Design a protein around this ligand. Structure first.
Ligand code: HEM
Ligand code: HIS
Length: 394
């Protein structure tokens, strides 16, 4: 073995900081480790990670060409990638996001939190963090949220093949699950591809055609990204933010009384309890990073989130401190040219949804003695997140 062994991902804890602390401790011992359970090298050194994000010819996203994302944005390189990213970015510009907030997200958030009011105890993971992003996507598609709820097993099977692609069983199951969702995706595209379509998805598909990029594969892939990113991945950001607040009731009270603190609560939450495992790249040629060597063809995990607990940048990093200024730079969206294009929507949903929740329930508090457990792979996902978020509402 070229690298020391590590066990960074497959350790559960009731302490949501355990993952960030493990990443930092490992980074202090070695720049690159081999995670036996996850099954690939993990880059932990900031200089290597930032270098890798910028050198896309050496560290590509081409591993996505072998699976269900082939034909989509993430699998593109170079100028092809830049052209399609410019079109996707149009849908996440500030004015567009503000319109989604007024038209979809705030009203849906109010309905989601309303549905919780008749119960003394609820699980905010299933009944809030997952529900709100699902319903937003259902309304973007002009499509029933209840029908999207039935895809959960398929969504997570799709995702598991996108993170550990050295596992042929996981890859095949991702392909199987995509094939079992293709009927739904096709129906959504065809309905919203009509000239009489009145959805954001309809506008996206028209804009795709006005920008000369409107193949059927492009339409399927934007729908797929909105399901996998817009619903599932966003849910874990909402979940981890809620936990950070529930675990710090004095901070939760401050944020309820001053909702202008919500952006900081979300950004600090991304530092304190990141919801991603890391970010994949493919090494395209033999490369040396200081005294480390990586071989052509190797898929690696960039762990920029190992900097979340760098105490030289963020003193007392195990403290959830929404007052850190400047706010910590987010590492959960990747970096360089591939930095998540959907981040503005995810951030806005977390803010608007939490604003609705905290306003509706002045009594919100974690259930004592039913502590969430945090680990990579929660609910068979590819996120670091809780298994449950039980709360008392009144
Ligand atoms: C509106 C919701 C979302 C949508 C539509 C979305 C969509 C996408 C798309 C299309 C890409 C590929 C970008 C490219 O390669 O140029 C991407 C990448 C990514 N997204 Fe998202 N996403 C969403 C939410 C999130 C959230 C909530 C997180 C994490 C908290 C996240 C983390 C990432 C990461 C880590 C990447 C990889 C970036 C890289 O390779 O450097 N996404 N997303
Ligand atoms: N991993 C899926 C879903 C996702 C979007 N953003 C973060 N995750 C994808 O790359 O599309």
């Amino acid at each position: 073995m070229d690298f020391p062994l590590a066990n960074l991902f497959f350790v559960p804890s009731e302490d949501a900081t355990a993952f960030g602390r493990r990443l930092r401790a490992a980074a202090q011992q070695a720049p690159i480790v081999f995670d036996t359970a996850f099954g690939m090298p993990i880059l932990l050194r900031k200089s290597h990670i930032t270098t890798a994000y910028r050198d896309t010819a050496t560290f590509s996203t081409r591993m996505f060409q072998a699976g269900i994302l082939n034909g989509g944005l993430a699998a593109m390189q170079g100028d092809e990638h830049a052209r399609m990213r410019r079109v996707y970015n149009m849908f996440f510009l500030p004015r567009a996001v503000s319109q989604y907030e007024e038209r979809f997200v705030r009203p849906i958030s109010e309905q989601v939190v309303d549905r919780l009011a008749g119960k003394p105890r609820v699980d905010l993971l299933e009944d809030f963090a997952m529900e709100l992003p699902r319903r937003v996507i259902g309304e973007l598609f002009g499509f029933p949220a209840e029908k999207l709820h039935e895809t959960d097993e398929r969504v997570r099977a799709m995702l598991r093949g996108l993170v550990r692609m050295h596992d042929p069983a996981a890859v095949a199951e991702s392909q199987r699950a995509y094939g079992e969702t293709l009927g739904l995706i096709t129906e959504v595209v065809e309905r919203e591809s009509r000239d009489t379509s009145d959805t954001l998805l309809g506008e996206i598909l028209r804009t795709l055609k006005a920008e000369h990029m409107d193949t059927i594969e492009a339409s399927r892939q934007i729908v797929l990204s909105l399901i996998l990113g817009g619903y599932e991945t966003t849910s874990w950001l909402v979940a981890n933010t809620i936990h950070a607040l529930l675990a710090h009731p004095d901070t939760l009270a401050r944020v309820r009384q001053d909702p202008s603190l919500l952006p900081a609560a979300i950004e600090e939450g991304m530092r304190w309890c990141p919801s991603i495992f890391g970010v994949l790249r493919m090494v395209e040629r033999d490369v040396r990073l200081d005294d480390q060597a990586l071989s052509a063809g190797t898929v690696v995990c960039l762990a920029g989130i190992a900097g979340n607990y760098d105490e030289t940048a963020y003193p007392s990093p195990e403290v959830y401190d929404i007052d850190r200024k400047p706010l910590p730079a987010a590492n959960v969206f990747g970096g360089g040219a591939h930095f998540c294009v959907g981040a503005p929507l995810a951030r806005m949903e977390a803010r608007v949804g939490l604003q609705a929740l905290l306003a509706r329930f002045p009594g919100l508090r974690a259930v004592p003695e039913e502590r969430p457990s945090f680990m990579y792979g929660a609910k068979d996902s590819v996120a670091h997140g809780p298994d449950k978020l039980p709360v008392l509402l009144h």
